Amino acid sequence: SQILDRYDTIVFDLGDVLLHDVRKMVKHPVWQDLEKGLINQEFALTALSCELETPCSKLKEMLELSIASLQVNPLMVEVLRVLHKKDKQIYCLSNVDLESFSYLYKQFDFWKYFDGIYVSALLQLRKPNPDIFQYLISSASINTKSTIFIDDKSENLQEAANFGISTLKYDNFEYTAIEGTPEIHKKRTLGEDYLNLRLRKFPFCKSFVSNNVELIGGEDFSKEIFSTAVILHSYTSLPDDIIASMCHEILNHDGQNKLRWCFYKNEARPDNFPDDLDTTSMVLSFLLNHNKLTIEKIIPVAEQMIANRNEEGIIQVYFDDNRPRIDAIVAINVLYLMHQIGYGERKELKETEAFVFDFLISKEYLKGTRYYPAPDVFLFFLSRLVVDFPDQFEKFHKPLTEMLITRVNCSTFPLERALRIIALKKLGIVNRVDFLKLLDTQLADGGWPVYGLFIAPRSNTYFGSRELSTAFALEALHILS
Amino acid sequence: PELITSLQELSQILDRYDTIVFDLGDVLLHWDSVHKGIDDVRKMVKHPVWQDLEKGLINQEFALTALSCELETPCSKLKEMLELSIASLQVNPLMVEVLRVLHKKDKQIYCLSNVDLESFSYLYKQFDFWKYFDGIYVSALLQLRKPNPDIFQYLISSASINTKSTIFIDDKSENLQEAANFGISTLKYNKDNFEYTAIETPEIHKKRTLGEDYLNLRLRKFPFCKSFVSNNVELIGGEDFSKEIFSTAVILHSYTSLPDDIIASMCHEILNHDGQNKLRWCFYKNEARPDNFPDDLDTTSMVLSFLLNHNKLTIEKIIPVAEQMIANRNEEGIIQVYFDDNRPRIDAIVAINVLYLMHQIGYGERKELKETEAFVFDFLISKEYLKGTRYYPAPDVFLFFLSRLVVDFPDQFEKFHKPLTEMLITRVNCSTFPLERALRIIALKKLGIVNRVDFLKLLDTQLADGGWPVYGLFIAPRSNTYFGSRELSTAFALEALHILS
Ligand SMILES: CC[N+](CC)(CC)Cc1ccccc1
Ligand SMILES: CC[N+](CC)(CC)Cc1ccccc1
Ligand SMILES: [Mg+2]
Numbered sequence: 001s002q003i004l005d006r007y008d009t010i011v012f013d014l015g016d017v018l019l020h021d022v023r024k025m026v027k028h029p030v031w032q033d034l035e036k037g038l039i040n041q042e043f044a045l046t047a048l049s050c051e052l053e054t055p056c057s058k059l060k061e062m063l064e065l066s067i068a069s070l071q072v073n074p075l076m077v078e079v080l081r082v083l084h085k086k087d088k089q090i091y092c093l094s095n096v097d098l099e100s101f102s103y104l105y106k107q108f109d110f111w112k113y114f115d116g117i118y119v120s121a122l123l124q125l126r127k128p129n130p131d132i133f134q135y136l137i138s139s140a141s142i143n144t145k146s147t148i149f150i151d152d153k154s155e156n157l158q159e160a161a162n163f164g165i166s167t168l169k170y171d172n173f174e175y176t177a178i179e180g181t182p183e184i185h186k187k188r189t190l191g192e193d194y195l196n197l198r199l200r201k202f203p204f205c206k207s208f209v210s211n212n213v214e215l216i217g218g219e220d221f222s223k224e225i226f227s228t229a230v231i232l233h234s235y236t237s238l239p240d241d242i243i244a245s246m247c248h249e250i251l252n253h254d255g256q257n258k259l260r261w262c263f264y265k266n267e268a269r270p271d272n273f274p275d276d277l278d279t280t281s282m283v284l285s286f287l288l289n290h291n292k293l294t295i296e297k298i299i300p301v302a303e304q305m306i307a308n309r310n311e312e313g314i315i316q317v318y319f320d321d322n323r324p325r326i327d328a329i330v331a332i333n334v335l336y337l338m339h340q341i342g343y344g345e346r347k348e349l350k351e352t353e354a355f356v357f358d359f360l361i362s363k364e365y366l367k368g369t370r371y372y373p374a375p376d377v378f379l380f381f382l383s384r385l386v387v388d389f390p391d392q393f394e395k396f397h398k399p400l401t402e403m404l405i406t407r408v409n410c411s412t413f414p415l416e417r418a419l420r421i422i423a424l425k426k427l428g429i430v431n432r433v434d435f436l437k438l439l440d441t442q443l444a445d446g447g448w449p450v451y452g453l454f455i456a457p458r459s460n461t462y463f464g465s466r467e468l469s470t471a472f473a474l475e476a477l478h479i480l481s
Numbered sequence: 482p483e484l485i486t487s488l489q490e491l492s493q494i495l496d497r498y499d500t501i502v503f504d505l506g507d508v509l510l511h512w513d514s515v516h517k518g519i520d521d522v523r524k525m526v527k528h529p530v531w532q533d534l535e536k537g538l539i540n541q542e543f544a545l546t547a548l549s550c551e552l553e554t555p556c557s558k559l560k561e562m563l564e565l566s567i568a569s570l571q572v573n574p575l576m577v578e579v580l581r582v583l584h585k586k587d588k589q590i591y592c593l594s595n596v597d598l599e600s601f602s603y604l605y606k607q608f609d610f611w612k613y614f615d616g617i618y619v620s621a622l623l624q625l626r627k628p629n630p631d632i633f634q635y636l637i638s639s640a641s642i643n644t645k646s647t648i649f650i651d652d653k654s655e656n657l658q659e660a661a662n663f664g665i666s667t668l669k670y671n672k673d674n675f676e677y678t679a680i681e682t683p684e685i686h687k688k689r690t691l692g693e694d695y696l697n698l699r700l701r702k703f704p705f706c707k708s709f710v711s712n713n714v715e716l717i718g719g720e721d722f723s724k725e726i727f728s729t730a731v732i733l734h735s736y737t738s739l740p741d742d743i744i745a746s747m748c749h750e751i752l753n754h755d756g757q758n759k760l761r762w763c764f765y766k767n768e769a770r771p772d773n774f775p776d777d778l779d780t781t782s783m784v785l786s787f788l789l790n791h792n793k794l795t796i797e798k799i800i801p802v803a804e805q806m807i808a809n810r811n812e813e814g815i816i817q818v819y820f821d822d823n824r825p826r827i828d829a830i831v832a833i834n835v836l837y838l839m840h841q842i843g844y845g846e847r848k849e850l851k852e853t854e855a856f857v858f859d860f861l862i863s864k865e866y867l868k869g870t871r872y873y874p875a876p877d878v879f880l881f882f883l884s885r886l887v888v889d890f891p892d893q894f895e896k897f898h899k900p901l902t903e904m905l906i907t908r909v910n911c912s913t914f915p916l917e918r919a920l921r922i923i924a925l926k927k928l929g930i931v932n933r934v935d936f937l938k939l940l941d942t943q944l945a946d947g948g949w950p951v952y953g954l955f956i957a958p959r960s961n962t963y964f965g966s967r968e969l970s971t972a973f974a975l976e977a978l979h980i981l982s
């Protein structure tokens with residue numbers, strides 16, 4: 001339309017806009033708890049089974065039938081498409097429970113036109129409520145004077161109009177051109193102050209070791225360089241002085257030969273413990289990003305990595321023929337370096353990429369990897385490769401996003417909440433729920449609790465640190481605020 | 482300003498007040514702190530993370546693990562130091578005597594202190610001055626911390642304190658300062674004297690209202706309390722049963738604010754229940770009764786106790802049924818579950834509910850009750866109740882019903898009070914099921930302890946229509962069938978809400 005081209009930003013509703021008696025269910029107050037993400041469908045159907053005096057299975061079939069009867073609106077989708085081509089900022093703002101949102105994301109394919117998807121079950125907010133409009137506007141930094149909102153309901157358009165956003169009621173299209181927390185900041189400030197103090201005191205990132213993921217009763221072991229590299233890659237808002245001190249510890253790490261890095265400091269290296277491609281890939285990828293190394297110096301190390309494939313063609317974990325292992329996340333971090341340096345189209349990487357893609361798509365990642373038992377870690381690292389090399393990894397985006405959507409608010413560990421927040425936001429989905437619960441678990445000194453990010457399987461030793469946890473939580477807070 | 486050195490003069494000033502608030506740390510209890518890394522527990526307790534533990538936001542393992550990094554001290558040394566500190570704890574003989582004297586003067590006496598749940602659990606078992614308090618307000622049970630004014634606002638509101646007649650005793654001036662802002666007079670406890678200064682939410686009610694409207698409408702429409710059955714405790718996808726009378730009787734005993742019109746309607750269901758004969762009741766309606774399934778003492782006890790309470794039946798009519806129950810003992814003397822020699826069963830909650838009716842009708846001194854009462858007592862004390870009972874798998878159900886009996890007949894069950902309180906404290910916030918939170922809140926408050934943690938978490942699981950989720954309260958053990966309803970869950974939750982406001 002000639003109307004929408006006057007606006008920089010268009011916000012789309014889903015229902016009866018892009019998609020076209022179960023009404024007694026969706027009007028019930030319990031359904032609003034479901035829409036808000038407060039409960040899941042199983043518990044919501046149990047309750048509604050009682051209030052609606054209907055066998056639970058009948059409500060499930062009525063709902064299943066109702067979702068599958070949804071059909072795209074071809075006029076609106078094409079409209080969405082033309083706006084996308086015009087480089088508009090486009091957002092989706094809609095009430096829908098989480099599982100329905102999973103089905104609809106899998107089932108349709110217009111999602112790609114959106115710069116950002118704001119769904120009620122991921123926000124714990126519902127669409128007539130002005131709070132959801134205010135959340136959208138500040139989080140997306142929307143200039144309401146150049147923003148128009150498309151909905152079928154007048155309550156929604158009236159609310160948006162009160163924030164100064166024009167409206168298009170979707171037969172007829174009614175157009176009206178409209179012309180007219182500090183707790184987060186405190187928690188961010190506390191956390192930044194905590195992280196900056198820890199890392200200024202100990203730029204070689206500390207770690208602790210134990211036999212459990214919470215590292216209860218863990219002992220101090222601060223003689224591996226990997227955590228330092230993880231933080232440098234993962235928390236993108238370190239002050240320059242800290243970046244420098246941590247870079248210094250990497251460049252001067254003594255578990256180092258010919259740009260092959262070892263996990264351990266020399267003093268702590270088990271006799272005969274080999275260099276590994278995870279530590280090597282991660283530090284090399286950081287040094288190249290910060291212009292401490294050239295592709296010329298890295299490429300021979302990358303060939304050794306290609307030389308390290310097993311009989312199935314998969315690049316292995318260690319520079320040691322007598323210690324053959326594989327790991328989907330080590331595969332990912334190798335592939336990241338490969339695409340960074342120009343190796344992205346080497347045929348010898350095909351089975352390593354196939355392995356990673358299959359690990360995603362088979363849901364085998366729900367079992368964790370050899371060194372990373374928590375499934376969201378695989379998803380997070382995959383999202384880094386997929387979003388940073390999007391043309392090369394196009395076919396990963398939708399399946400990765402599907403998996404992440406189902407895992408929103410599925411675990412209580414703060415670091416796991418952080419990874420889901422960061423990964424979903426990089427994929428254009430706003431996960432406010434995990435964000436809210438992440439804030440609640442900050443400790444009083446500003447740091448989050450220790451978490452066992454990775455594992456030495458031979459000794460079932462978990463490694464982790466408050467620095468790692470806090471670094472991820474701060475990235476999550478910054479990326480959504 | 483008024484410096485006091487005379488223990489006599491102290492007693493004379495405290496007597497001028499109706500309410501005395503006592504601190505624990507360095508007032509009633511005293512301890513030492515210096516025992517690779519730090520060598521002073523004072524460095525732990527001062528740390529910000531320790532405030533999270535004190536407020537109940539984390540447990541000891543969690544706080545130590547974090548402190549082991551901040552204080553650069555091996556976690557296991559921090560653990561040893563705490564245990565040594567706690568083991569070193571001594572009672573203050575002067576202040577417990579002052580406390581005891583105030584108690585013997587029928588003063589209203591409260592305890593307000595910062596202590597973490599594990600520590601407070603140990604202290605409660607270890608010492609025995611707690612009986613002198615009318616109410617106990619501990620930071621880990623309140624998720625509030627003592628300097629903060631809102632812990633004072635909470636105490637004053639929870640206990641309906643007249644701050645004009647209230648005096649607070651504490652060793653920390655910051656605590657006294659904050660108390661004086663609320664008009665409470667202060668008494669600083671020093672190593673060498675006393676300093677005496679004479680001094681002159683909306684969400685909760687919305688939730689209460691919504692929950693009351695929910696339950697009143699549900700019980701009006703279905704005064705025979707509905708029930709669902711499934712093989713799992715949250716009854717996900719459970720089927721409608723609604724053919725047992727016991728839920729109706731449990732609601733009448735457990736939620737004490739039903740309007741008279743609902744009470745009348747539910748009482749009619751009990752009296753017109755076809756599964757009864759000569760004032761013995763059967764769990765099931767006839768249409769669902771298994772062939773040869775007997776009447777049982779649990780439904781009977783709870784039904785007769787209610788009908789007596791509401792003057793539907795005389796003591797004269799109950800006492801013969803109660804004598805039959807005494808005739809239902811086994812070779813160990815424990816009263817059994819069913820009116821049926823061919824189906825011998827014992828269950829500790831059924832025993833509790835039979836004992837309740839016994840004491841209520843005048844049978845409380847009958848010697849034939851001894852083995853039943855010792856069964857329930859050993860069941861508590863042996864921690865065997867952590868395994869559930871035959872018909873009630875959730876451990877807090879046994880503690881809840883025990884607390885009804887023990888608080889309602891306190892002269893006969895004195896020896897139960899402290900062990901039961903000890904157990905309940907260890908269970909604060911130990912499970913997520915709303916009904917279980919509600920049982921713990923209700924039971925602890927009857928025992929004088931405010932469990933605000935479970936309360937706040939209970940509030941957050943109310944659904945938008947005012948009802949709580951269904952929960953399987955009791956079990957048909959053979960088929961592993963759970964029974965429950967939203968009415969049951971909401972009734973226990975509303976009672977917990979009322980009892981803590
Ligand atoms: C970077 C080290 N690693 C893989 C070698 C992380 C995935 C785990 C590990 C650490 C120490 C011993 C063994 C394995
Ligand atoms: C009062 C009913 N009863 C004991 C008879 C106590 C909860 C459980 C029960 C219900 C149904 C069948 C068997 C036992
Ligand atoms: Mg709509």
Ligand SMILES: [Mg+2]
Nearest residue numbers: 504505506507
């Ligand atoms: Mg004190």
